[PDB]
Structure formats: C-alpha cells, structure tokens
Amino acid sequence: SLVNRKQLEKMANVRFRTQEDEYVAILDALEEYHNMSENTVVEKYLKLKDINSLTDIYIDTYKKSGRNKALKKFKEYLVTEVLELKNNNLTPVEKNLHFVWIGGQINDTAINYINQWKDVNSDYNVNVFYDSNAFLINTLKKTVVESAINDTLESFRENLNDPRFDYNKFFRKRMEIIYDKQKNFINYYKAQREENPELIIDDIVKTYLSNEYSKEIDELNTYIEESLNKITQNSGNDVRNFEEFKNGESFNLYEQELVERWNLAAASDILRISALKEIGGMYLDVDMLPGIQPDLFESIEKPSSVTVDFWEMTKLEAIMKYKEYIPEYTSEHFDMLDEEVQSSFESVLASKSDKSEIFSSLGDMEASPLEVKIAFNSKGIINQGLISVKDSYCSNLIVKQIENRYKILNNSLNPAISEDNDFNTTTNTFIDSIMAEANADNGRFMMELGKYLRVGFFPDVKTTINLSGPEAYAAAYQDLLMFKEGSMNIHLIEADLRNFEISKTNISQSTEQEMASLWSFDDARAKAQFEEYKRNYFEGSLLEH
Ligand SMILES: O=c1ccn([C@@H]2O[C@H](COP(=O)(O)OP(=O)(O)O)[C@@H](O)[C@H]2O)c(=O)[nH]1
Ligand SMILES: OC[C@H]1CNC[C@@H](O)[C@@H]1O
Ligand SMILES: [Mn+2]
C-alpha cells in the first residue's frame, strides 16, 4: 500500500515549520487517493499523476527545503504504487487477433502462419488489416529500385570489375538515383493532388507505372482484383473502413510512410497501435507463430554448444518436418542434428494426433486498463507482439509518442525535401537541421534520425525502431511511470520493462519468416545482393537488345 497522509506527514516532518500551501495540497491529494475505492483504474492513475505533479511543484518552488529528501522518496513510492495498481486490477482482453498486411497481395506463407493462430484460437475473432487503396505500393517500390539498380550498374559499368567499387559504394550511388525517383514520384503525387482527390492511391500509382515503366493496366487490375479477393477470403479488414483511424492525427503519418517512403513496416507500426486502442486484443506480425505447449520437448535436453535461437528454431522445424502444418518450412537447423536427436523429436511428435497438443491457445487473457504488453527478445522489447484492452492508457501514450517523434522528424526533413535538391544535398540540409535543433532531453533521439531517408535502401538502417517502433513503447512506459507525456531521454532498464512484457509461452518468435526482415537487411545480405545484381547484369541484361 502507498503511505497514507499521517505516514507522509511523519516522513516530511520539519519540527516547528509551518505547512506551506503547496505541502498541504500534496497531503490533501494523497488522502483523496486513499478514498477512491469507487473510481476507475484510469481515475486512480490520474490522481497519482496529480499527486506527483503537486510534489514536483513543491520541490521546484522550495529548492532548499528540508522536506525535499522525504518528498523525493515519496515520488519513488508513487512509481511502486502505479505498478501495484497495474498488476492488481486486470480486465478481460477482447478476443481479437490483429494482423497487418498492406502494400500488396498477401503471400500463402503469411496465410499459413495466420491459419496456425485460427486453428488453436477458435474463440478469437481475426482481423487481417489491408488497405484496399494501396495494393500497388510494393510493385511501385520494386519497379523503382530495379530501375535504380540498372541505372547504377550501367553508369559505373567501367568500375564493376574494380574491387574498390564495393557494395557500400554501389548502395551510395543507387540511393542518389532512388531519391531522385522518389522525389519525382512525390512531386508528381502532390501535383496530381488538386486535380481529382476522388482518385485512390492505386489509380495514381497505375498512371506512374503504365506511364514511365510501361506496365500493362490489364494485369495490374487483375493483380488488385486477386489481392482484394484473397484478403477478403482470409479475414480481411479494410483500413479504408476504419473511421477513427482515418479521422485521427496519426493517419497523415500512416500515408507518409505508405505513399512517400514506401515503408510498409512503419505504416504497420502506426496502424497496429490504433487498432489496439480502438478495438482491443492482441496484435501479431505475420511472421509470428503460436506458443509451443511448454512441456512438448521437456524430455529432450538442449545441447550445451548450441544457441537458444538454434534450439527454438529446431523445435518449430521438428514440428513442421513431422506434422507438415506449414508446407515448405525450412529444416536447415533440424538437419544439423545427428539421427539420435532427430529420432527423439520424431518419437515425441509421433504420439500427438491434434495441433492443440503441439501449439497452446491464448484463452481468456487479462491486462491492466493502464498498459500495453509487448514481446521481448535478448536485445529488448519488440512490437511484433502486443496485448491491450480497448482504449488502454498506454495505447494513447504510444500514439502520442509516435506523433511527437514525427513532429520533430518532419520539422527538419520536410524543408529539405521541398528544396528540389538531390539526395546528398537533401541529406546534409536535414542533418544540419538535426544538429541545430538537438537539445539535452531530445538530443540522443536526434542523431538516431540521420539515416531516415535510407530506410529500406541501405544495410543496417533501423530508424523506424526509434520513430514508430520499440523506442516509442519504452518512452510511453517511461511517460506512465514518470506521470508525464513526451519522454525523449529513455532511462528504463530491463527490470522496469519486465512489468510490460508478454510471457514467452504466448508467442513462438524464432520462426523462419522472422529471420527474413521485409524493411531492413544486414551487410552480408547487402554484399550478396550486389554480387547478384552484377551477375544478372553481366550474364543477363548487358547481353540483351
Ligand atoms: O510489404 C509489407 C511488408 C511489411 N509489412 C508489415 O510490417 C511488419 C513487420 O515486418 P517484419 O517482420 O519484416 O519486420 P522485422 O520483424 O524484421 O522488424 C509485418 O508483419 C507487416 O504487418 C506489410 O504489411 N507489408
Ligand atoms: O518498428 C519497425 C519494426 C521493428 N521490428 C518489429 C516490427 O513489428 C516493426 O514493424
Ligand atoms: Mn519480423
């Protein structure tokens, strides 16, 4: 229990000192809190917030006060009490599974993963969010990148056999051309905006494609129709019918990522938290699988020399080898084990006739009205799994974190874009604005933003995580525990974040599709892509008329 008024009066006592008005305000607010049995969890949190605010006013007003040490201890007690309020007052989570697949047709691989969740959660309504207006974004991005690859290989043909023209130099020159093609597209998009705003994204994208890359609108229309038909058959839920999201102050950010940046991961980041806030339930990336029954492989000991990641992937690969639930699932880890260990997996699985004996169900989940729970890995929290009741306090804090992060980004980036200059010029203008605008609080967040323009086009560019992804979640949890909004300087450690984490039992994260990121790539994949592009040029395109 949080200290009562008598107990704080004892802690912050200063003999023969008159009670300041600001001090009595804290004592009155504390006493009111202890008499809020009839009130909601959010009302109780907002009272604690008020008490923390009144305590900060006292400390800021009377800088040298003898009460200040005890009041700073009381501030620690308020944080502890928020955690007790969070952990002790749970309400049911709406039985909704939310997935997002935007920007193009959904692959059978995504559907096969989604179907594993449906099969062991018969009691759950499933939404696969898609955007009926933007099925051609993945096609636009692929077209433009392929064009920029060809133009780079052509322009630097003479240098391609030179090892000093490495993968890094290739991606730098390609980015110059990609930025000009993206600038050409957005200067086109916003010119066309102010002709017929009753044209959907796919309509304007078809004219860019079947103008300047000579694509067949017959086949593009077929692609849209097959995409709409397929998603409609697989629990499709259209973003364009989600009115609170369309009307809200994050929709412009969604459309920025979807249409200007072609970052479907960032767009999914913005949409998923609005789906949780507005509907409640559990969000999952399409590369996530249900938790494995915790004791399924209890009888098989992990080899000492092998990583946790190797062992978790081998368990899913064993399931898919012998039960074949997901066709064409890799066995690349499982195949590294000798016949003895392989046979132990086979004999464990040979005695199970139903998927419910392999994969666990979510069942009846509960969470705090205050919180959003987040998945985690050895590197920290990750928003590939989220649980929230409808209109949770944290869902609102996360939306506002994302909005504030985009406010700061766009304030420095958008001037540069609008000055019709090339990639490197735009980059330096942007970076100069960042270093000029940086302050003590937000400084560290700034400087994580410098590579924003490169997201999806360069190896090891992860800016999305700092804007719409995990950092926004950590900052929202800091907002909740520090009774404020707009935390930019994150000091939470894993002990703090552990209170907001989804149990490992509720998600299998170590899947085949999880190892293949759709919006980022590492140096090894970059080197291999560069070798692939030179091969397809020298042995393919160069030899053609
Ligand atoms: O063309 C795409 C690519 C990505 N995504 C969304 O972005 C999420 C994150 O993708 P990914 O798992 O590649 O990100 P990572 O786990 O590598 O950070 C996916 O689950 C989708 O909801 C999408 O909707 N369409
Ligand atoms: O924030 C970008 C991405 C980070 N990795 C997990 C994904 O769900 C997310 O979109
Ligand atoms: Mn993933």
Author numbering: 2 to 546
How does the study describe this entry?
The geometry of UDP, isofagomine and noeuromycin bound to TcdB-GTD was established by solving the crystal structures. The uracil ring is π-π stacked with Trp102 and sandwiched between the side chains of Trp102 and Leu265. The α and β phosphates of UDP also interact with structural waters and coordinate to the Mn2+ metal cation, which is in turn coordinated to the carboxyl groups of Asp288 and Glu515. The cationic nitrogen of isofagomine is 2.6 Å from O of the β-phosphate of UDP in an ion-pair interaction. A structural water molecule is 2.7 Å on the opposite face of the isofagomine cation in appropriate position to act as the attacking nucleophile for the hydrolytic reaction of TcdB with UDP-glucose. O3 of isofagomine is hydrogen bonded with the carboxylate of Asp286 and the Arg273 guanidinium. The O4 and O6 of the isofagomine share H-bond interactions with both carboxylate oxygens of Asp270. Movement of the loop from residues Gln510 to Asp523 (10 Å) towards the binding pocket occurs on inhibitor binding and is highlighted with the black arrow. The entropic contribution for isofagomine and noeuromycin binding was –TΔS = 0.5 ± 0.2 kcal/mol and -TΔS = 4.2 ± 0.3 kcal/mol, respectively. Larger enthalpic contributions of isofagomine binding to TcdB-GTD in the presence of UDP is consistent with the Ki values presented in Table 2, making isofagomine the more potent inhibitor.
TcdA and TcdB bacterial toxins are primary determinants of disease pathogenesis and are attractive therapeutic targets. TcdA and TcdB contain domains that use UDP-glucose to glucosylate and inactivate host Rho GTPases, resulting in cytoskeletal changes causing cell rounding and loss of intestinal integrity. The GTD domains of TcdA and TcdB catalyze transfer of a glucosyl residue to a nucleophilic threonine acceptor in Rho GTPases.
